[model samples]
Target chain A: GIPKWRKTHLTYRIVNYTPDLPKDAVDSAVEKALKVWEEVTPLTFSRLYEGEADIMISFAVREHGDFYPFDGPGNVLAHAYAPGPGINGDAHFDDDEQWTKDTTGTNLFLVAAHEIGHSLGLFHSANTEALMYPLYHSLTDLTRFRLSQDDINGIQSLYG
Target chain B: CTCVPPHPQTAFCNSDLVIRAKFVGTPEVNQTTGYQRYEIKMTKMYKGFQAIRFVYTPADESVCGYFHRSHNRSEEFLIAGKLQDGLLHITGCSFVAPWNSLSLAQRRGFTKTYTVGCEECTVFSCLSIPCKLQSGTHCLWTDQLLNGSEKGFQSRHLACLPREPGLCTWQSL
Candidate 1:
């Protein structure tokens, strides 16, 4: 039986930001990340520029809210939650680090891919090659940002 | 309402038992730049129930104690668990490597074991997520390198409830 908290689908919205990066870059990065999952499953995402949402994606440099505080630039780049309500499905990026479109810097797409893995109610996979692995890797090649079978299986196990 | 215990010949019917598991120490970083510690807690809905939680931390010498600390001045309430037949449920937080830092995934590894602590904690009769491992087993670990160019560590951990339930054990490679 499904838990009362578990929902058939989840929604997210992007909120406040820092001036370090362009707003379009964040938007594009999120769109790209959403496309990655949309291609794999029947799940769909709608953007909410304003108002409340089940999940919220935003950028911040240091301590935003909650107990988990972000370290200064470089140590940790971002984090997200599994499927649910309130902070359960939110994703946050550390603006303290240089967010980039390419691999040299923290590739927003790759990190978002990992964060999205959490958003789908999937946990970290033991398979190191999997996107949901607890560690971080630079996907300078962009192609390297793709998800592994373990990642797909983890998420599919939840919704499919 | 009056409570009733199951007959000696029959299995327990109560599914709302609560169990709590906690780590004894803090997690510290190792000299080689790894971190280590095991922290976990599981809760059930009723009283006098027992459950087990397995934990794994990175392999670093500098790492010290790693345990769950509750907010709102309620230490014990922070990490708790409840049971449902074969399923063991938990709601709490633990120290984890950050997700964005690539080093944790590339170099660190963690694994743990669990043993159910109640009369109802049976092997075949318990609820558990259908894992690839054998019965009564639950494991989570990572050996992959960071996917990003930046080199560093991210202290992030994950909390998940398996689709199935029971007293499951896990080990890291």
Candidate 2:
């Protein structure tokens, strides 16, 4: 049987904060990630106070509540589920890696963009140039982290 | 990107069949142990053929490693009849751990699905072989190693009976 789709705008809340990084840094990184799609589509994201919405965006380190856990550092920076209720649209980040706004660290913006692709019910794409490519490519410049035409097309196809 | 013959008598086919598999009910996830389990109520296994073996080659080598490990694990599970019914259940199949531990250049896994067709065929063996087959001093093995034609490992055809009219075709996707 096909799964039911939650027809509502997703809201996320950052319950736990990363010890190493400042709270604003995480907020900005998330904002930037959200902005990547905001400009392209009509979807709107609002920070939640409590309870669960369609999507829950939060910062998680190591083994979170989900079956998929962070592998310390280096393997995967983060992952997101497809849109739905409960675990769907939940975004998790690996605390092991040094996340920073700058290019020196794992570009949170880039990984977040990729994970956000998952949040929008998109799967990994075979096109290397696409943002949803399974492998991570460390971007030296933040601008270089923008989505390719294929990536944009994929997200728009689902949301639009 | 020119079309070439797969074998002297074999013609190359380059079509990919896409299938959509679905997992019903709520997937279970354990945070502390790092395990996510999906109950595959149904799956659509797309079977197709490509003229070449490596048409959509993965850019990341770790992908091969992941595929290999998963394949090995899946084979073991299938042997125990754990894959009965329409369920395509997968556990601890996170790409995160491997992504961190292995180098990007490494291949995590690979799958080569072969297609075989026969007319008036009676016997079919789904048994697992030891991977290595030997006849006297001559031995045969399966690996990435390709012959001069890059068509893959060699196999021997025992007979071509006219009455049976059997035809076996192989393609990788």
Candidate 3:
């Protein structure tokens, strides 16, 4: 069985920002990336400035502290823990990779959205169309973006 | 570069320890590193050192640490991980799955086939067509495109095993 958040209301905090993007850009990207999930489920994510948030987001280079060190650039873009106490439900990006708001480099919004799905307790989906799918691709445009049917069904199954 | 989802064989090959074990009790936390050490009742050891009884993972989720929610002894998992600092370490990135969710072929891969059949075999994961392995020992896994089911065809049904001394092929149970 899949693990899920116990509550509808959740909070997130960007613990640090990647050097590749402006601080405000990172914030907007994260806000919009989370909104991807918010549009479908009853889950509401609020931003926190201090203290521990349910979903703690950060970007770091290799060997930050958690034992799972980032491998420079290509292989692992980012990873997140499933929902639980302590470090669970937090997302971390590898700062080695260039994070951008668009398709030039790794898109912060796209990756954050996918990682957030994990923070929400969703596993990588096999569906190619699903945002929860593990393989990373540049989702160039956010204006027309919508969760794939597979994505919608998976999230609603846990949150609804 | 794109991040390819980890395949079972790929993960198994990369891990230093692999086993089917049930969590024995609550985890012991390393306050300094926030790493959680979970003791296990080892039902079987497929690939790992002898007499190893515990697995360590970070308590922090941001670093890809994993947590097994259930304390029920009956809930067993097929876990694979690296021996980091002489302690077996696993994260959400490592190959960890509930025993019940695995297909019969997948289970066999971890228990029997992988050790012998996959001796020199390599499982390559890809999301596109016109793909090829540089060596005969490699089996191109494209289940992400060919198979639509959740577990995937190559993942759930096939194991890259040795057909001959230098050649490997996808074999099934």
Candidate 4:
């Protein structure tokens, strides 16, 4: 089902974490990323420590298990499946990229926020202010992962 | 919303082929893959295609096809696309719509020009009004090199409007 068709409450699970950041740091970033969407909708996110969830988050390197293989270090960063059933709301981050906490490395929180937008069923929007620009901005502050009243409008259209 | 941004001249500057064609009939739809193939009857070709007619292919998700699925069959659309893996396809970023919508087509003549002119820039087949107006009305543009100038010309547009990494402003000139 599409994100628009999803229940207000949703669940997500991280299949694996990138060594780019500590496990706890990765956990923190993932939590914050979901909150970005929750704040907009009545949606609630629950992470399963060891089971299935609507959205499954994972990290992989070049030629990962899925069809979209990673491109070494720079050509591609990450991608997510639009809302659907098994593995549909999933997101995969490139393990090759230096995922980190600050503006220096490829910021994990920023990417998580962007990928989560896709996991929730939004397409790459032409609106630059929205998180779905098809281009990633590494320097975006962690606190500002969510963006635009326009983006908020998109989410609310689904959850509200 | 205050975010209604100005149009980017580079997008038009970046299309592989820009053409105006009429939707011959209902497009081929692949419901299983969420793809729509538009068999547009070619009226004119500005870039990429060597000639017009024979057939206009459909569109799909894997092929980056995007369209409303509901449009007038008679209206000529200005389509901008790329030749990906030998398949010509268009994405959401493409300039595909009714020829009348070309009213908003801005010309970046300062960077490049399609001097050949579409016989129907806006009103379908301008073969009658057949007038010449050096307008900067650009339906397409790109940063690719000018290698193929055989049929008529090459894309002499190399203007890369420098952009920053932060939030983009709509006012791009």
**In terms of DockQ, which candidate is strongest?**
3
Give i-RMS (Å) per prediction.
20.2, 16.9, 5.9, 15.9
Candidate with better lDDT, 3 vs 4: 3
Candidate 1 chain B worst ten-residue window by lDDT: B1-10
> How big is the positional error of residue A7 in model 2, measured in Å on the Cα after superposition?
4.0
TM-scores of chain A across candidates:
0.89, 0.87, 0.95, 0.91
lDDT of 1 by residue, A59-110 (tens): 8766788434554553346777656667767787877766666664456777
lDDT of each: 0.46, 0.44, 0.77, 0.55
TM-score of 1: 0.50
Best by TM-score: 3
Instruction: Compute DockQ for each candidate against the true complex.
Output: 0.01, 0.02, 0.20, 0.07
RMSD of each: 19.6, 17.4, 7.1, 12.6
Per-residue alpha-carbon lDDT of candidate 4 for residues B78-169, written as tens digits (9 for 90 to 100): 67665544545655435455656443223332123332232222111011122233323322221111211111121222222212432222
Better of 1 and 3 by DockQ: 3
Rank ordering of all candidates by lDDT, starting from the highest: 3, 4, 1, 2
Lowest lDDT 10-residue stretch of candidate 2 chain A: A1-10
Query: How much is A61 displaced in model 3, in angstroms?
Result: 6.3
Question: Comparing candidate 1 with candidate 3, which one achieves the higher TM-score?
Answer: 3
Model 2 agreement with the true structure over A1-160: per-residue lDDT tens digits:
2222344355667666677678888788887878787777667788776877555666667668865445455335676776666776777777776676675546567777777767766666667567777655554356655668887787677666
Error of 3 at A65 (Å): 5.8
